[PDB]
Amino acid sequence: KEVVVIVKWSGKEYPVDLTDQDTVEVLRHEIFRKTQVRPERQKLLNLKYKGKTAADNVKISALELKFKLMMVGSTEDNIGEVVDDFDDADEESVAHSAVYLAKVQRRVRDYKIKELAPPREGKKLLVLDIDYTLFDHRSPAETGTELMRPYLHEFLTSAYEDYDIVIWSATSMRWIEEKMRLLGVASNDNYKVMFYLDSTAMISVHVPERGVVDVKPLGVIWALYKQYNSSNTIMFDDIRRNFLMNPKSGLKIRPFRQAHLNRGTDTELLKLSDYLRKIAHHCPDFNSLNHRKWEHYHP
Ligand SMILES: [Mg+2]
Numbered sequence: 001k002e003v004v005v006i007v008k009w010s011g012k013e014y015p016v017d018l019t020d021q022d023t024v025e026v027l028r029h030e031i032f033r034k035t036q037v038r039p040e041r042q043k044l045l046n047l048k049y050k051g052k053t054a055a056d057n058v059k060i061s062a063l064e065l066k067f068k069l070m071m072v073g074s075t076e077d078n079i080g081e082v083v084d085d086f087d088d089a090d091e092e093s094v095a096h097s098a099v100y101l102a103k104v105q106r107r108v109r110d111y112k113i114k115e116l117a118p119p120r121e122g123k124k125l126l127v128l129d130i131d132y133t134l135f136d137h138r139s140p141a142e143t144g145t146e147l148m149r150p151y152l153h154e155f156l157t158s159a160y161e162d163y164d165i166v167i168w169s170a171t172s173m174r175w176i177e178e179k180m181r182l183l184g185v186a187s188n189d190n191y192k193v194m195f196y197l198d199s200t201a202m203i204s205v206h207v208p209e210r211g212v213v214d215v216k217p218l219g220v221i222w223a224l225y226k227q228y229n230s231s232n233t234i235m236f237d238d239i240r241r242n243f244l245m246n247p248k249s250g251l252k253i254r255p256f257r258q259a260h261l262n263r264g265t266d267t268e269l270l271k272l273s274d275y276l277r278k279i280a281h282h283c284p285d286f287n288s289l290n291h292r293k294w295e296h297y298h299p
Pocket of ligand 1: 081129132133239
């Protein structure tokens with residue numbers, strides 16, 4: 001079951017953890033997770049299946065034994081994501097399969113959370129994406145103030161009244177730390193962020209009809225911090241795919257693009273602060289909500 005593939009890239013070795021039932025496609029996604037080289041940019045030099053380049057659908061099981069996999073490829077400020085053109089808006093699931101649960105458990109076992117501030121009794125949990133969620137990561141700008149989504153700090157202060165806050169970005173931890181300083185979130189007098197999660201906490205899951213997708217599994221947090229669960233957790237992300245393994249707990253935020261043109265009109269965070277306050281005060285079980293209809297929630 002448990003398998004380790006050693007990948008050699010750019011003069012370094014990267015031990016990749018997976019199982020023998022994972023496919024080459026999953027391997028590519030785990031390689032991306034380790035190296036920041038995208039799956040489509042990876043040339044896997046010495047991975048043959050019956051004398052030929054193993055296809056993405058080949059299970060790891062069906063081949064080798066100690067071995068070092070040579071990968072040639074490049075990783076690009078073109079960081080993060082801007083859209084998912086294959087977003088399925090139909091209102092599941094492998095989100096309840098053994099394979100998925102085991103993937104969460106491995107993150108729970110191996111990923112080391114660095115607590116920046118402690119949980120507070122009775123609070124809900126808010127998880128926040130960064131790119132296009134809290135700021136415009138695609139525009140050039142001389143200051144962070146210019147790229148910041150309007151009402152960011154007022155939104156975080158309001159949320160913090162009722163929610164402990166976690167930041168989860170599909171990027172390196174370094175990028176997160178840098179942007180949180182740039183945006184003034186890192187050290188604010190009016191709120192605290194509990195911890196940050198990065199792309200290494202994410203998992204790659206095959207979703208039939210769709211292929212392998214990388215998601216942000218709230219189950220990792222829920223396993224480690226048992227005071228939170230789906231009944232009191234909500235996540236904001238502009239990319240719906242990120243909550244494919246916990247669809248009821250995600251709210252797809254409108255992306256904040258081209259700050260220079262839209263900074264004067266964007267008020268999504270103001271509106272969403274109202275939403276968060278209302279559900280924290282009026283909804284004892286968030287699973288009863290339809291977040292797609294958040295703008296019409298008036299208890
Ligand atoms: Mg984003």
